[PDB]
Amino acid sequence: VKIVTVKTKAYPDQKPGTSGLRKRVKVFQSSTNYAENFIQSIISTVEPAQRQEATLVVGGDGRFYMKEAIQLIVRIAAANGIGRLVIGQNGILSTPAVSCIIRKIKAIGGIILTASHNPGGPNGDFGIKFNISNGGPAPEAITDKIFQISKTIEEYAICPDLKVDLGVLGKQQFDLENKFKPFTVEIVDSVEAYATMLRNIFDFNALKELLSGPNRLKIRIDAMHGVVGPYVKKILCEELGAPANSAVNCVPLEDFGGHHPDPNLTYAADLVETMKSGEHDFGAAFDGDGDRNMILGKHGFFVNPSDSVAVIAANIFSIPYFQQTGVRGFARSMPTSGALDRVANATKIALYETPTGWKFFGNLMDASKLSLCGEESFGTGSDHIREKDGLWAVLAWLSILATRKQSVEDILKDHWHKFGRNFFTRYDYEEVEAEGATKMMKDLEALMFDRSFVGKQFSANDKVYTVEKADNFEYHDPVDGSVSKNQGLRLIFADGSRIIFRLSGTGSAGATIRLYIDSYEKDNAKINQDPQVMLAPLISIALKVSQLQERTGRTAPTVIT
Amino acid sequence: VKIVTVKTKAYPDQKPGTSGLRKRVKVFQSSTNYAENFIQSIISTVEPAQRQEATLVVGGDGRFYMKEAIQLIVRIAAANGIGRLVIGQNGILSTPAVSCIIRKIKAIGGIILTASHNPGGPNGDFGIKFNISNGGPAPEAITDKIFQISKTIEEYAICPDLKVDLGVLGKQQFDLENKFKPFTVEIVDSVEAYATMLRNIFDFNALKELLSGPNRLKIRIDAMHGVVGPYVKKILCEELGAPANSAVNCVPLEDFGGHHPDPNLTYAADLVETMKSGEHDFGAAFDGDGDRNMILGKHGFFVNPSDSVAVIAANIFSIPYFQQTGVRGFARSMPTSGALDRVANATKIALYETPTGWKFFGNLMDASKLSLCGEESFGTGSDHIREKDGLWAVLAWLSILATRKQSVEDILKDHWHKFGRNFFTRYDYEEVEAEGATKMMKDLEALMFDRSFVGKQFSANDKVYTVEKADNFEYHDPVDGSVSKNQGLRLIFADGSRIIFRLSGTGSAGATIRLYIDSYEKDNAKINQDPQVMLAPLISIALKVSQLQERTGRTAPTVIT
């Protein structure tokens, strides 16, 4: 094929955040050279001499525009001298799988076509996320580099006639005009490399007995029409032995079936209705690219993501990987409940409180200091890859159920009776105007930082709350030395309870206030009650010191989790 | 997994024939330790110090018993010290694919569970074919050493508890007692490695234009329910774009649908009748393990296997592989017609007449002296692997058709006019009485050695046949040094015509007299007339000169090919 040089006109808004470049599908399709300029910038950060012996892993969640985005990446990678492209079959490749294949075949990096839980289709979103050699997402130093080139780009090289058949497995070789070495495209089976990794981390024999035996565990997995569908079928139904009716919605639809692939009780309300009937012992829901999960137990019993990282850490050695590799350390994001801390302190293992964002967990994994990590936003993982893994959290839960012979409910009741219950809730204030939310945060910060606020007592019913610590979260990363200031206002009470405020939506007229309430309760009689009824006294106090209603006009949150 | 040693009793009839151990399924499942002893004998030929770093490839055509036998190969190969086994998914792997994979991954050899053109099922045939490092079948020195061990084996080693699942792709590792290194079973896709090899041999673009473009060559490919099924759908249908309706009987059945998987005019009768409708331009059928093929043109136009090698050799440069590799030499088996010979002599390329049974061609291929070869038993191939390849011959005919743009009947009319027509037909005289057959052969042998025989003139209807050479065919292989004598009575005439006698019998049921007629014709008009009438003179002369019906009682040929 021939290598053509196209003279282009640069764009100012192609700034890749740590989730890559997420935009509307109509933007990439209408803006001439939009996807082509960004794809060319990604390969331009790769040294020209490093390209011929370099491999790029490409894959996506199967949403609308993904097939044409992969075909564009092939034409540009070839014309730029990239030696080999490992593409998943039909372009399908889950985010945890892209991280597994990059580390397995020593790839220089990978391009993941996905907007995560963000909707797909002609009127949905589309994103291009770049991962580097360690399998993790590209860091700021690299995303800034891609941004500088995407806005100064005068030209881009492309092979217009190069057309690869994405549905056929195997190697495809293309000869480029007058070029001595051939361009190679390797189409891999979407699930195989990822399933071989899990087969070593877990005990697929104890699990086969658990899922398909006579006295077996009856599960129900909702893949939400996203990229984790084929992975549930091939691993949980085919190899582990669970009946095909266990894996529900396991077929990737380009529009996710007009639904949002996000693991939460309202977006995954169908699973919640299937679990109330009492027919199944374990239920689980996933996201677009399969790197997050929602664990449900019998009769609808919701397992909070913060309590889930504490259950796996309390039963970590029932998983073969950890028994052989050892637990190098535990970690959680600052807003995540204190349930993990109880376990890490009793087990005498290192605990790390990091700011929101997977990169902080990656830095500690690459430095051999982090084994298990959790986020309150449905996220659990481990140093097996450099991204979050929804299906790994589910097989880790099924491993604990098989080792203990107990129900999801009895394992958590047992956990709260040993460490105590960290009642957790997150209040989301969605389309809030910037000036009222920013002023609210500055006032609360000036109030907290008063020389007498530490020691102050708040009371909203029976128990009283004494403030022992009050600060605006600041983290110094021990690996790259970075200093992440202004990460969240924390009111830490002497009984272990916390109230956290986070302004997520910052640089925009529509700001988003995230309010996290964490109430610790060692009282064995109070541990089995409704979290909103026990958290009411501490929520009322958060609303009073923040003057939230007064600064935002909000008498109620948009979403409660 | 445990390693136990089973004491056994040896068998006198476990003799590996030229194409492996072909035998009725009844002997394999009824006789205790039958398959176990032969599999252990094959693995015993592997020097102990070389077993850990040795890989064996395993796969079969999918017939009855193939799955239980593969589970026996895994346990015995693991307990014997073999470090790695590469098996096709579900155990399904065609003979040409097994040869491709062995040569590609540098395997020590491979064990193919297939009885080829023999039928399968509870009351059918079974067979364990052993191939060596070069990808081809095990030579006499190796098959005979396996026979010497099976004849005297006193015990075998086995891991009873080991049970791998052929359905799941990927790497599976198992730990054996007192073994520092783990056992590896690598399940590979049945078509991938094989499709990549054909993708570098033929131009898949021109072929996609031929089968899916405006003209659309309406083909019909019958897989006879054997192993080539998945290979036809994945390569000819999905990749090259041929409408699913073209792939008839492409699903591997353990009983082959209650029929012989043999591509000849008697067993592949359905496909011929469907071709005689006039709708399709090209038709083809394959056998059990997939190394054979039957070529049909519009209206049922049968392309004789001996002429088919000559066509591919006359237009051999239409295929990219031979353009870049060149032609080291042509070869055929002695019984096969002289059509290829007429083509070989029209060029500066060597020609080899070899004894029937593919193993002879391999020796010429390893010494880089053979590029294209074929046998009148519907077998065609090339140095690209060390086995025959029916799907290769089909894509080679589709390559010739895309270059020529003519119909299968016109390509052969042009061929028969340029080199003349070598009329060929196969008269198999089934089960005759031993004394009458040996005497007929001895009588005609002495008659062919009469001092006044060469130069004598035969005459029947229109052609006068003068004897130029008359001998009893014997072979000296240039690589192994062996001398195979009395292979067949060759009555040769100076015009280019020939008659062949191959008395293949047994000290059991009876003796078969294989009559091959090779009537060469060079007249522009007579060549387009029916083979049965045009061959008539040489057929009567063979009967009158050998006194056939006279010493055998056979007035009509039992088999006709």
Ligand SMILES: O=P([O-])(O)O[C@H]1O[C@H](COP(=O)(O)O)[C@@H](O)[C@H](O)[C@H]1O
């Ligand atoms: O045994 P014979 O003498 O009748 O030999 C016949 O069958 C053998 C097995 O065929 P395959 O390689 O397809 O399994 C062939 O190689 C040989 O060409 C043919 O003459």
